Structure formats: C-alpha cells, structure tokens
C-alpha cells in the first residue's frame, strides 16, 4: 500500500539522520569509509563482509532495510569486524576496539530514546507479511 510505502520512507529518514549523527564524531572517522585495500592489503584476507558508515548511508538509499533490527546487524558488523582485526594489547588496537564500543553504544542508546517501539513493530509486520 501507498500507507506502508510511506512507513518505509520515514524509516530511511530516521536511519540516514542516525547514520549522519555517527559520522560526524570525531572519534569515529576510522568507521567513516571502507579500508583503503592498497593500504592495508592483508584487510579483505582476514574480514570477510567490510562495512562502513558510507557504504550503510548507500544501503538505505538502495531500501536494503526494511526495520531498525536490519539496520544494527549492520551497526554490529563494524563494530565485530574491528575487534576481530585488531584484537592484540598494543595502544592503536586497544583505542580502535574502544571506539568501536562507542560507535555500537551510541547507536543503541539514540535508538532506544528516539525510535517509537509501536514505529519498529509496525515495520516488522510489515516485512513479515512480504
Ligand atoms: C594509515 O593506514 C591506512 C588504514 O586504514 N589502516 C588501518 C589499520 C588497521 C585497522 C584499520 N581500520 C579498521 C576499521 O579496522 C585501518
């Protein structure tokens, strides 16, 4: 329906302005674009699905997601995917994993004040029935 059509749509604003609230941080810039593969070569060998906050703002505007639960299995993803390459006791490793803590809790937490929990129940329902 035209009704439902307008219920995705609200969705991808409210994820494009959390998705834009996390990419100005300072703190989070290392998160902001993929791993440059000329850099780091070893990157793609060792992290099998790369995410990052540009390639999640393309996803929305491609109706990728369809409820804020497929949104953070995104948000998750970056935050796994840099514990899992950079896990040693070194300082850069251990301000990298701390970041990417921050990057996972701020999200949760602008959703959990933010998003209207009856908002994310229609959505599912709506995906359910596709
Ligand atoms: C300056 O080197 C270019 C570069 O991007 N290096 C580099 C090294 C280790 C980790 C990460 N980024 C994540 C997200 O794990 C980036």
């Known amino acids: 329906s035209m009704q ?6 609200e969705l991808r604003i409210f994820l494009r302005n959390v998705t834009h609230r996390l990419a100005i941080d300072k703190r989070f810039r290392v998160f ?5 593969p000329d850099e780091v070569p070893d990157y793609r060998t060792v992290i099998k699905e790369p995410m990052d906050l540009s390639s999640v703002i393309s996803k929305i505007d ?3 997601y369809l409820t804020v639960k497929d949104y953070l299995r995104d948000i998750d993803l970056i935050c796994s995917n840099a514990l899992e390459y950079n896990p040693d006791r070194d300082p850069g490793d251990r301000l990298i994993r701390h970041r990417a803590c921050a990057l ?3 999200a949760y ?5 933010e ?3 009856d908002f994310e129940q229609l959505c599912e329902e709506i995906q359910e029935s596709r």
Do not use: C, G, S
Not at 109 to 113: F, H, L, Q, R, T
């Open 32 to 36: 902001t674009k993929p791993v440059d």
């Open 109 to 113: 937490a602008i959703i959990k004040e």
């Open 62 to 64: 491609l109706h990728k």
């Open 115 to 117: 998003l209207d929990e």
């Open 104 to 106: 996972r809790d701020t």
């Open 4 to 9: 439902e059509e307008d219920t995705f749509r």
